[PDB]
């Protein structure tokens, strides 16, 4: 009756679920839809400061497109 | 009501206690091998929610199974005192209950109760695997019927 | 002939892992000499630009280097594009 | 931000707790027993029952023990196992980490130190011997684990755990380094201290190894620590070889695939636990230094010249 | 400081577990419970006497080998250089050097438990 | 800077610790081993500060031989512990003459 | 032990190109092709002079030339830029690979419109 | 070297590290490439003792660039006196220097 | 700034951990934690590879020294930092030793002991340069097999001589 | 399968690297202006702060030479706010 095994997995599998999409959802929430930008090198990290500075609200995850320039 | 609250926390405590108590891997004589007979898949020790741990710092209920001797006596009391509270003791078989078949023997102490406090006396010689598996059940009922933090509240 | 064949028989019979580990370790050393793609691996790392190639002042007579990153002249990498 | 931390820590503890149920139940079904089913439906309430009873059990402080040493080790064991869950490339890693495996490897070596210190801190034979068998166990697996780790990701490009998803992509990494996964899987078995290589515990040989004077809560943190360790390093071998596809628009699609990959692999860890006798730590360092080390060099030499062999050097970024 | 926050939280969460597992669940010690365990009997009296190794030879070789692997950790970055030719020979040279040292120890006894 | 001061006085007490034997050689041998940790941290501090790419070499290569010095060190202590039994430097004087 | 010289606060102010990084790298391939002459002039100054204070004029030229570049694309097909740069934004690594369809729509404006 | 075997056969053994402005992996510059360059090619073929008094200025500036202690001391004087009078009053921060 | 100086302060009294002769692994406790925070010092300056290396091989190296202590260098009553009076005196003398100068550095920033260095923290000493797409530390280490060459040979050959040396000295005929 | 994918992963990386060096002239033209603006900003502040000191040349040559040097960032963020210090000086390394 190994189908009695599955309830152990069912909660356990759901238990392993939470840190998966949450780490994606909080990243989505804190960065406004777009995913968490990663900076493994100076170029990427030097970018985030420029995006934080240009936005004028001190957030790197808000981007101004072609409407910003006139 | 305070008594209602203490009763609820009381219900939480014993349920964990009686569900998750861990018998000692202790065996002496004829009773020990029948004790592991019920641990075999026929009666399934573990399906009642218990698992065998070895050291005194590990287990909950001492399961004394076999003839108690004068030479065995100092270690049994030492190993029993070494188990942290709460701790329970059940006495397998006629021999460990008291005296047994060798009650009159020079090298047998007449009763494990003469050395260690006992909760339940499971009889039979050897007790059938059914009988002692009830003895665990009776201890679950006995663990259920306590008022440890309840007597403290009214203390 | 006979000695080596029996020796290989003995090694494959007693400790197959060691006569194995000597094999993968054995040819991994001599394949580089026989490798035809090592030159491409050399060209792989050279092609990858990390520092941006600062332009050069043109006082005349450098036909090889272009005046714009669109003229055909200059080092190219269509071998990678094919690859 | 801290909401992400609790959602990373709290589910692991419940997952670890429910590991004890399946440990006692699939083993039993794999053993003609029925497993714990008397506490709630099918025993799913048993992991809870274990937790409170262990916590409400009397903590014990042996007279000959070093009190500060006796307490720091259980903290180290549980904390490292829990903090081991932050850097994995689970679709959106909590901390991107250039040296993902080095962070993985460094504190995995520090994890055995909690295993190491508890033996003498308990001040007896049955724990000192178990502590010293931990020395020989980590003498064996550590000298080679870095070699397997280097070999598999040398085709990845760098030490970043996130790039593993990109590297695997089309096909399973095990298809390219299957003898390495043969090396890696059972060496993780040799570090998690499971049945074939659980000499640090040693049920039959020395009562309980580095646990004999431990009781109640210190065990509860120790029991969760090594159960957290096996699941995490199994999740490590899940991404190392069996990494699934990841769609940026639907990150949850990775979670469902990744969870089963580390779950079916976990069932294996419970699978070997039933069928195999115990390695004597004599042959444990003997085997991992007689056949394991000379072999793992050969594929390490194989796996370094071979990116140069076919002009398949992976990019670092 | 994100790694600091999870590190601080992790060691904190561990400390609560030991904190309420030492005060909440009662306290009753009467010496022999507090005594060391010797499978039921009283120990010979020590746990501090020299527990001399029988595998001391392999322990130091681990230090040499665990040290030398740190020399080849830079391998993934060492592959992406303009000079993979001498990179191949030098990196290979290290692996044969460890192989020779293991082979040297293997032949002159060594790894087998010293008696 | 102040970080440099903290880790050169790490040498000083390590220097004091090494050439001050109280009971046994193992503690001093460990102090010799840990003495290079300041040496590692010392050398590492200038090299990332000064951005000299090649000389990142020596912190690892100092680690090759400093721990190799320890490797023969505690293996020497094995030879003492068989003839001498203990590892006491006070007893370690059989060449009194 | 001498004098330091710094250009005053007036001549170091330009009409700064204010657009996010993702948009810049989305059009970087086209930006680097034609808008290159001020760029190539700028760091021949940077590498020959080895002094940023001697290359402000080239910095003005590249800033304004990029502004004309952004003026051209905004005027001809502003909308096809929108989906291309926003999907670059969604990529944490700003990967070009998950952009081919959107890149295609961008590519055929400037090839045929301009 | 006591025996400059390096120069005899002409093959380098350890000279690649030596000085800071040697060739670097894909040309990663050092902190003081300019200052160290000026000092090194100042005192080349001139003699060790015939290098201190003449090629001095290129050296203390280079060892300045390495440690930057006198400038950090310069920043110490700026910061110390800054906290001296702003606590007393007078100076109020301009709105770009504190956000 | 805190962490940069604070971690180095832990590196100091951590070094007092083993320089004061406790029981040998209590000294092992002393330098394993400073090795842990020593990773932090180089970490804040970048140095991730080197910081993880010490947190890799020290633990590997320190793994066996415990065994030798408990197997062939331990006593009937193991030492501790409070039991013996001299080691406690050694412990404390390692506490006011740096306490005076850090107060001297925090209050005057011009401490002259042996070397002359200012005390404006250490955030200043960092750089403004850009690494591009390559980490300086991780590539200088990777230059082992491209430009090390001879520097590689002397290290590898000595490791061979190492396993010979650690064998013959302990062989005992 | 690995060789084909690894070659492709490389092909994207040079494509990514091509974009990076295409954006270098604009970014370098911005950083030098940002750095030079702020160095003057410190100098303008330094004019009013240095009045009590007996001997102080305002903006004297730091070194004996007149060639420009990369600015020791202590001069850059020396008198800025604490958060701006941690955001850039310790920003990268502490960032995740
Ligand atoms: C480095 C700093 C080391 C500081 C120190 O003295 O550590 C002693 C500490 C305890 O030694 P022990 O052999 O367990 O003996 C404890 C009692 O003396 C013997 O056991 P006990 O049961 O007497 O322990 C309680 C005792 C001693 O207090 C403690 O054990 C409490 C914890 C240590 C407090 C200091 O309490 C008191 O004396 C009164 C405290 C008020 O030794 C260590 O090696 C611990 C170092 C921990 C460093 C930080 C790690 C993170
Ligand atoms: C997570 C767990 C949540 C539930 C915890 C409930 C409390 C358990 C505490 C441990 C057992 C003691 C207890 O309940 O009360 C202490 C009380 C303490 O006061 P007491 O007087 O009842 O203690 C027992 C009697 N003497 C003191 C003589 C030993 O003890 C009991 O309730 C045991 C009877
Ligand atoms: C294309 C050309 C180049 C090819 C290069 C690659 C090499 C190809 C040829 C060899 C391929 C295989 C190499 C590795 C072989 C396995 C390791 C080895 O040394 O084996 C022999 C070794 C040695 O066998 P032994 O210990 O019995 O000793 C045999 C006798 N002597 C020593 C003389 C040789 O096997 C072991 O060490 C046993 C390990 C047991 C581990 C625990 C029990 C098993 C648990 C269940 C595992 C089930 C599978 C799980 C898979 C998970 C995957 C994620
Ligand atoms: C955090 C780390 C805590 C380590 C100590 C844990 C603990 O409570 O140990 C028991 C020890 C001792 O517990 P204790 O103080 O209850 O033991 C003695 C009790 N009397 C005094 C009544 C006899 O805790 C502290 O010393 C809000
Ligand atoms: C034997 C080691 C390998 C060959 C020598 C070598 O690495 O030379 C590198 C370089 C160049 O010599 P080379 O002979 O390797 O030249 C290049 C050859 N290909 C292109 C095939 C790689 O020489 C040195 O670094 C010499 C000094 C170090 C070695 C001293 C040995 C005594
Ligand atoms: C033990 C703690 C070890 C922490 C560690 O290894 O961090 C690696 C990592 C490696 O960082 P990194 O090399 O990935 O670069 C950091 C920037 N990102 C992540 C965007 C690429 O260290 C850090 O992230 C630095 C921040 C913490 C610095 C201080 C640590 C103090 C630890 C005290 C103990
Ligand atoms: C085949 C001929 C050599 C031979 O006999 O090899 C086996 C021999 C003994 O091996 P052993 O496991 O010790 O045998 C049992 C008793 N000890 O062992 C030896 O002869 C020495 C084997 C050394 C192996 C070194 C491997 C280094 C790495 C190789 C791949 C690169
Ligand atoms: S009671 Fe009977 S079965 Fe049990 S030990 Fe005694 S003789 Fe044996």
Residue numbers in the entry:
A (entry chain 1a): 1 to 70
B (entry chain 1B): 25 to 179
C (entry chain 1b): 1 to 83
D (entry chain 1H): 2 to 318
E (entry chain 1A): 1 to 115
F (entry chain 1K): 2 to 98
G (entry chain 1X): 1 to 114
H (entry chain 1e): 1 to 99
What does the paper say about this structure?
A key group of these are the respiratory chain supercomplexes (SCs); these which primarily consist of complexes I, III2 and IV (CI, CIII2 and CIV) in varying stoichiometries, which serve as the minimal functional units for NADH:O2 oxidoreduction. Here we report in situ structures of porcine respiratory SCs, determined directly through imaging porcine mitochondria by single-particle analysis combined with cryo-electron tomography (cryo-ET). Our structures, with an average resolution of approximately 2.5 Å and local resolution up to 1.8 Å in the best regions, enable in-depth study of mitochondrial respiratory SCs in their native states. Our in situ structures also capture numerous reactive intermediates within these respiratory supercomplexes, shedding light on the dynamic processes of the ubiquinone/ubiquinol exchange mechanism in complex I and the Q-cycle in complex III.
